[PDB]
């Protein structure tokens, strides 16, 4: 299930000091080509709402929004704070892996080294620099380029059964049905439907949700991802890889060996409906991370533009 | 009383974001000819400028590579050959590069389009139940234009200098830049560029000084130009003494305010190739009920 | 049954500008008397651990502890210099938590009904943190209180070693248990009630923990309120989550906080204290249950210590 | 080399907290004769001293009274109306105890605990020497030593408080230290903070700061103190090297308290001549933490 590093890796492909990995496949020419896909100006946000009500993998805590001062305060007391202008201010506490996200190459690995031989000792507490190598700031202008939706739900004409493993054949079959063709630097966005089952669940159902096996991609997608020179793979599930009822070889192979970024908890329902209606599954994607030095991932609001 | 109330209907919660139309996004995309990209964000960390008493953003790890050096058997999520690092942030949503929502500021008892201030509540009571930033989760992706006031003036701006309508129009003309409806205007004042070289005393003084920014007479012009948003590389956008513009932009016009953007590298590039118009991806995070958002604006040429 | 305010309240008892409520029952003489109960020097912490594993009423977040710098950092990088170059090595940490997220006192600013809080304080006085928080009845008003005499009433043992799910603890139960224990309450006492509920939480799996908060929970009922008033208690704490019985109106919250100005303690841990009291027969002790000094807050975490 | 490793056994994680015994708590309780109490905490808010780069504590509300003014129908969770709140803070961000896991030198902490035992919270935090090991400690006898009044005025900037000063102050007060005591030291430093403007507050931490010096450590050992707390930020004198931190936390297993507020207690003791008191200075029960906020209460 875990592909041997020596037979399948991108270490050294972009130099022995590179910290960007497969983001290097997104070059200026790939961005210009993506821009030519903005023909209609349609836009879609591929994020879930950042609030305390969304899926987040235990033991991670849900994002938590609080206000510092509100409109209600001025109803209560017109004389709040220091001028005729009235204002509201707020705060957030959240896991950076707590919502729609990119995971950096510093997020996961196996053994004592990360992508391109970076030692795990380089990934420290925040007060010691956090991810001092392979931090998400290395890709603060990346993931703006060409995106491609693969709608596995519509390809399967049904429910992915509980814990279904999405294969190479499934991905290629869906792209063929769509008459889509991948290019180097593409960000692949996979619709599994899993997040579309969350919000209707009651509290017991939401506990069960994470105890269940969960649909996602399998090990035989990893050579394909390498062959297609994708920069990142995102999905509308929580762990990208299929999760059983714990090896996680796809995480290890993508992040450490290929230097390919992982996107999770994206929201693809409205994008997928639009692509079904206009037949265009390739689009311009603005999926830049936040500029967070030493972080091992970021929340974002990916925008698909057609 | 100059205002846009009702312009887009009595139920509208998006304001001047409605100037960004699909056709205008298509036009902006045609500006992507080289593929050059520039992040207009400052780093999110505890060392950036933030208006007191706002807390600096604060990053912590939940588990790190160092933990596995210390204890190879670390199993945050159970026994696995896979090793992981996870992290967290606490920050003001007004604590870094930001958009301010229309729910961020007003005067009197009403916000944009007659929304009562009673609609803007604690997070447990819905936060901004109207005019929350989620209303523009697909906005601020379109055409951007830089106006470089430092370059126009030929020197660093005086402490507390009021940037006038004449300065904005004059600088755009010298650049041969033409604004279009729906544009996001990004203003280089230079103020934030001074921050990172400051020592702790300098950083305290930074917020005691008057601070350069736009003045009241820019508001009719911003209205006439049908801008969707105005952002700057200062902390408060408008000039601050040792806030009429906030009130008029957010409440009366429904025009968004961007603060603590980073424009130094973009400004050098635009001076070189002569192009101050670009495609801008400056979408907010999707945070329902929030009164603003962090972001990472990307200028694309 | 919500007890009518006019028949049962302490408004004005300690003046119409008072913000401390029943904490005023704890007097220097009552503290001196409580200190005389320190005869053996046995100590018991009545707190649950502050971590992300404890009971917290949804949608409140679990407390969350993170490190800023750790020993592991120096294993990975001996030269780690967080402050900076030094032979001394440091570890530092942070917490994010609800102040109602663990073992707690709830201030009189935490709960009320209608438009007024204890002693006629307008609800408009309780604002966002940036506008002063609880500008009246904040927990700082009792930064020196809740150190005095405590009395355990072990309702679990009184009822034979267990309480049914959702059981309503009555006046008669409280008096009956105190009589069995040969305990006598005095004005100013902090009453600590063992319901056993928190003793069932930690073995639950994620589904069980979700169910825990969806179903009825044992606690005190409405007819305990006049008794609490009678007895001139300063505060009432329990090892459940809501103090009063919760169904599958919450009049007790309203009557205690608003009408009487009596403080509510929740998610205390009483199992070891109760075992000790069963063995030595002493249910009255010195209690150090001071809140944190947090101006404008509507409650506080704490580590209550029973001293015998 | 002076140290307590092994004094309380190889498995011990409590250090000098073991000097506080039941009999010593009983003795301390007899000092409660007036029933007067004093909080020795500063307010937890964003306005207090906190050593950079630590951030100030930050209080926010989840729901407030104002919400029901704006919207009578607010239903966060009823006729009952509720206010709920949150705190984000460094555990070293206010009045505090520092655990034995907070500081050391070399690769070993108190009693030979490896520094590899002190990990991220997701990996157990301080898996040994966490503050939970003393969740019932620091309730016992406290003694104030008022160095400000002993010196007859405010201490000079960066003044090193010596063994002779501590002994001299105790002698002037007619105080007698006993084993198990918690020593509480008034330097006055925190009493200068709140009147400072933002520039002064920046300078405050760049300046040398008054505190105890190296020659106090053998005396702290000989006196069998459980912990030493002060109303400065770092306990030991800080220059522009921190041997006292290392010797106390790693070698002796003695706890360090910082940012205590002693103004009102010190005034009371000067008036009635009593500098010994019952102290309730328990930490919060935070497993794997390397310190804790608290509200220490002195009772006389």
How is B115-172 classified by DSSP, letter by letter? -BGGGB--GGGTSBSSS-GGGGTT-SEEEEEEEEHHHHHTSPPPTT-EE-HHHHHHHH
Residues A80 and A74: beta-carbon distance below 8 Å: yes
C299 and D85: CB-CB below 8 Å? Answer: yes
- How far is CA B279 from its chain centroid? 16
Structure tokens at D168: 């001299």
Q: How many CB atoms lie within 10 A of CB D271?
A: 8
Q: Which residue has the tokens 């500081």?
A: D103
Of the candidates A127, A208, A210, which has its C-beta nearest C69's C-beta? Answer: A127
Q: What is the CB neighbour count within 10 angstroms for residue A159?
A: 11
Both tokens of D287, joined, read 């497993």
Instruction: Tell me which chains share at least 3 CB pairs under 8 Å with chain D.
Output: A, B, C
Do the Cβ atoms of C265 and C236 come closer than 8 Å?
Answer: yes
Residue B52: exposure state from Cβ atoms within 10 A (0-12, 13-18, ≥19): exposed
As beta bridge partners, residue D183 has D143, D228
Cα dihedral B75, B80, B85, B88, rounded to 10, equals -60
**Non-local CB neighbours of C229 within 8 Å, separated by 6+ positions:** C8, C10, C260, C262
Q: What is the largest CA-CA distance in chain B?
A: 67
| Dihedral sign for Cα atoms in the order C71, C77, C78, C80 | negative
Is C160 exposed, middle or buried (CB count within 10 Å of its CB: 0-12, 13-18, 19+)?
exposed
Rg of chain D taking only CA atoms, in angstroms: 20
Cβ contact (<8 Å) for B117 and A86?
A: yes
The string of DSSP codes covering B47-100 is: TS---TTSPPPEEEEEE-HHHHHH-TT--BTBS-SEEE-EEEEEEETTSSSEEE
> D295 to chain C nearest CA, in Å?
5
Q: Which of A100, A96, A92 is nearest to A55 (CA)?
A: A100
Q: Which of D68, D79, C248, C63 is nearest to B124 (CA)?
A: D68
H or E segment to which residue D218 belongs: helix D217-222
- Residue A184 Cα to chain centre, angstroms: 18
Residue B122 CB contacts under 8 Å (≥ 6 apart), including other chains: A66, A67, A70, A72, C128, D61, D62, D63, D64, D66, D67
B35 touches B283 (CB < 8 A): no
D-chain residues near B111 (CB < 8 A): none
CB contact under 8 A, B60 and C68: yes
Q: Do residue A125 and residue C67 have CB atoms under 8 angstroms apart?
A: yes
User: Which residues make beta-bridge pairs with B107?
Assistant: A85, B110
Tokens for C56, please give them.
């917290």
Phi, psi of B128 (to 5 degrees): -75, 95
* R_g (Cα) of chain C, nearest Å: 20
Residues 6+ apart with CB under 8 A from C53: C62, C202
Q: Name residues whose C-beta falls within 8 Å of residue A55's C-beta, 6 or more positions apart in sequence.
A: A48, A195, A198, A206, A209, A238, A265
Contact C118, C21 (CB under 8 A): yes
Torsion on CA atoms A195, A197, A201, A204, rounded to nearest 10: -80
Neighbours of A185 (CB within 10 A): 24
**Tokens standing for residue A174:** 């869906």
Q: In what order do the strands lie in the sheet with C263-266?
A: C43-45, C305-307, C284-288, C147-154, C190-194, C235-238, C263-266, C104-106, C299-301
Question: Which residue, B210, B251, B264, is CA-closest to B38?
Answer: B264
Of all helices (H) and strands (E), which one includes residue D200? helix D198-206
Structure tokens that stand for C59 in this block = 């949608």
Q: How far apart are CA A301 and CA C39, in angstroms?
A: 63
Hey, are the CB atoms on B296 and A40 less than 8 Å from each other? no
- How many Å apart are CA B54 and CA B49, to the nearest integer? 10
- Nearest residue, CB atoms, A66 vs list B83, B123, B283: B123
Task: Give the strand pairing for C168-169 and B184-188.
Answer: unpaired
CA distance B179 to D65: 46
Taking each helix axis from N to C terminus, what angle separates C206-214 and A203-211, rounded to the nearest 10 degrees? 180
Residues B139 and D238: their CA atoms lie apart, in Å, by 52
Q: D231 is written with which tokens?
A: 């109303």
For A72, which of D53, D70, D86 is closest by C-beta distance? D70
Q: Where are the domains positioned within chain D?
A: 1-300
Residues A76, C55: Cα–Cα separation, whole Å: 33
DSSP code per residue over A40-108: S--EEE-B---STTS---TTSPPPEEEEEE-THHHHH-TT-----EEE-EEEEEEETTSSSEEE-TTSE
**Is omega for the bond preceding B111 within 30 degrees of 0, making it cis?**
no
The CA–CA distances, whole Å, from D144 to A26, D22, D273 equal 66, 21, 11
Cβ of C126 and D66 within 8 Å?
Answer: yes
DSSP state of A16: T
Hey, are the CB atoms on A130 and B24 less than 8 Å from each other? no
Dihedral, CA atoms, C61, C63, C68, C73, nearest 10 degrees?
A: -110
CB contact burial A205-243 (16+ within 10 A = b; e otherwise) = ebbebeeeebbbbbbbbbebbbebbbbbbbbbbbbbbbb
Q: Nearest CA to CA, how far is C77 from chain B (Å)?
A: 8
Q: What residue has token string 């301390």?
A: D28
Phi then psi for residue B79, to 5 deg, are -65, 125
The pairing of strands B98-100 and B292-294 is antiparallel
Give the nearest chain B residue to C59 (CA atoms): B124
**Experimental technique:** X-ray
Helix (H) or strand (E) holding D103, with range, is: strand D103-105
**Smallest CA–CA separation between B266 and chain A, in Å?**
13
Instruction: Give the residues across from C153 on adjacent strands.
Output: C193
Q: Is C203 exposed, middle or buried (0-12, 13-18, 19+ CB in 10 A)?
A: exposed
Name the burial class of residue D34, with classes exposed (0-12), middle (13-18) and buried (19+) by CB atoms within 10 angstroms of its CB.
middle
Contact predicate A73/C127, CB 8 Å: yes
How far is Cα B148 from Cα B221, in angstroms, rounded to an integer? Answer: 17
Strand partners, D255: D227
Name where chain A breaks: residue before each gap, C-N > 2.5 Å: 82, 245
Q: From chain D, which residues contact B within 8 Å (Cβ)?
A: 46-47, 52-53, 55-56, 58, 61-64, 66-67, 70-71, 74, 76, 84, 88, 115-117, 119-123, 198-199, 201-203, 205-206
Asked if C135 and C126 touch (Cβ cutoff 8 Å), the reply is yes
DSSP 8-state secondary structure symbol assigned to residue D115: G
CA distance D155 to chain B (A): 24
Please answer whether residues B245 and B221 qualify as being in contact, where contact means their C-beta atoms are separated by less than 8 angstroms.
Answer: no
Nearest to D32 by CA among C288, C36, C24: C36
Enter the tokens of residue A243.
């999760």
Of D71, D97, D139, whose CA–CA distance to D249 is shortest? D97
Contact C69 A128 (CB under 8 A): yes
CB atoms within 10 A of CB A57: 18
Resolution of this PDB entry, in A?
A: 1.6
Q: How many CB pairs under 8 A join C and D?
A: 296
Nearest CA to B185 out of B201, B171, B202 is that of B171
Q: Give burial (CB, 10 Å; 0-12/13-18/19+) of D102.
A: buried
Within B224-294, strands assigned E span 229-232, 256-259, 277-281, 292-294
Strands (E) across chain C are located at: 43-45, 64-69, 88-90, 92-98, 104-106, 111-113, 147-154, 168-169, 190-194, 219-220, 235-238, 263-266, 284-288, 299-301, 305-307
Supply B141's token pair.
């992706």
Take residue C172 and report the two structure tokens written for it: 């008669």
Do residues A134 and A115 touch, judged by C-beta distance below 8 A?
A: yes
A204 neighbourhood in chain C, CB within 8 Å: 207, 210-211, 214
> C75 vs chain B: nearest CA distance in angstroms?
6
Contact A208 C209 (CB under 8 A): no
Of C50, C74, C144, the CB nearest to D285: C50
Enumerate the β-bridge partners of residue B259: B98
Q: Which residues of A touch D53 (CB under 8 A)?
A: 127
The alpha carbon of residue C207 is apart from the nearest alpha carbon of chain D, in Å, by: 21
Residue D99 · residue D3 · CB < 8 Å: no
| Structural contact between residues B113 and B255, judged by C-beta atoms closer than 8 angstroms | no
DSSP tag of C36: T
Q: Which two tokens stand for residue A188?
A: 């692949």
- CA torsion A36→A40→A45→A46, rounded to 10°? -60
Signed CA dihedral, A142, A146, A150, A151: sign only = positive
The SS3 assignment for D73 reads: coil
Q: From D74, which residue of chain A is nearest by alpha-carbon distance?
A: A72
Say whether C75 and D116 touch across the interface (CB within 8 A): yes
Backbone angles phi, psi at B180, to 5 degrees: -130, 150
Smallest CA–CA distance from D67 into chain A, residue: A72
Please give the backbone phi and psi of residue A254, each rounded to the nearest 5 degrees, phi first: -65, -50
Instruction: Output the CA torsion sign for B121, B122, B124, B128.
Output: positive
* C27: closest chain D residue by CA: D35
Question: Is the backbone of residue B43 left (phi > 0), alpha (psi -120 to 50) or beta?
Answer: beta
Q: How far apart are the C-alpha atoms of C158 and B107, rounded to whole Å?
A: 61
d(CA D204, CA D231): 14
Cα C300 from Cα C47, distance rounded (Å): 12
Q: What is d(CA D119, CA C136) in angstroms, rounded to the nearest whole number?
A: 41
Pick from C64, C68, C130: CB nearest A125: C68
Backbone angles phi, psi at A122, to 5 degrees: -75, -15
Contact of D47 with D58, CB cutoff 8 Å: no
Q: What are phi and psi of A206, to 5 degrees?
A: -70, -30
Nearest to D142 by CA among D229, D232, D236, D218: D229
Nearest CA in chain D to C98: D86
- Bridge partners, residue D63, by sequence: D84
What DSSP string describes C74-115?
Answer: HHH-TT--SS-S-SEEE-EEEEEEETTSSSEEE-TTSEEETT
Identity of the residue in B90, B119, B122 whose CB atom sits nearest the CB atom of D64: B122
């Amino acid at each position: 299930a875990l592909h041997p590093h020596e037979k399948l890796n991108n270490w050294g492909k972009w130099g022995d000091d590179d910290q960007r990995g497969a983001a290097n496949y997104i070059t200026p020419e790939r961005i210009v080509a993506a821009a030519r896909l903005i023909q209609t100006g349609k836009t879609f946000s591929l994020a879930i709402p950042i609030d305390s009500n969304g899926p987040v993998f235990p033991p991670r805590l849900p994002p938590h929004h609080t206000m510092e001062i509100t409109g209600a305060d001025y109803v209560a007391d017109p004389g709040a704070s220091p001028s005729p202008i009235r204002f509201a201010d707020d705060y957030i506490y959240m896991p950076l892996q707590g919502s729609t996200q990119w995971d950096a190459l510093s997020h996961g690995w196996y053994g004592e080294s990360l992508y391109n031989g970076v030692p795990e000792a380089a990934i420290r507490s925040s007060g010691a620099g956090g991810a001092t190598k392979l931090g998400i700031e290395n890709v603060k202008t990346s993931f703006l380029g060409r995106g491609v939706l693969v709608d596995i739900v519509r390809f399967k004409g049904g429910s992915l059964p509980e814990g279904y493993t999405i294969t190479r054949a499934d991905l290629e079959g869906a792209l063929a049905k769509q008459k889509s063709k991948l290019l180097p630097g593409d960000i692949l966005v996979i619709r599994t439907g899993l997040v579309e089952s969350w919000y209707d669940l009651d509290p017991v159902g939401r506990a069960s949700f994470f105890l269940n096996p969960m649909t996602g991609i399998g090990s035989d997608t990893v050579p394909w991802i390498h062959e297609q020179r994708l920069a990142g793979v995102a999905a509308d599930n929580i762990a990208l890889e299929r999760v059983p009822h714990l090896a996680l070889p796809v995480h290890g192979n993508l992040l450490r060996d290929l230097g390919v970024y992982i996107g999770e908890i994206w929201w693809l329902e409205e994008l997928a409906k639009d692509c079904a209606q206009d037949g265009r599954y390739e689009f311009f994607l603005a999926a830049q991370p936040l500029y967070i030095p030493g972080a091992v991932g970021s929340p974002l609001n990916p925008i698909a533009v057609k």
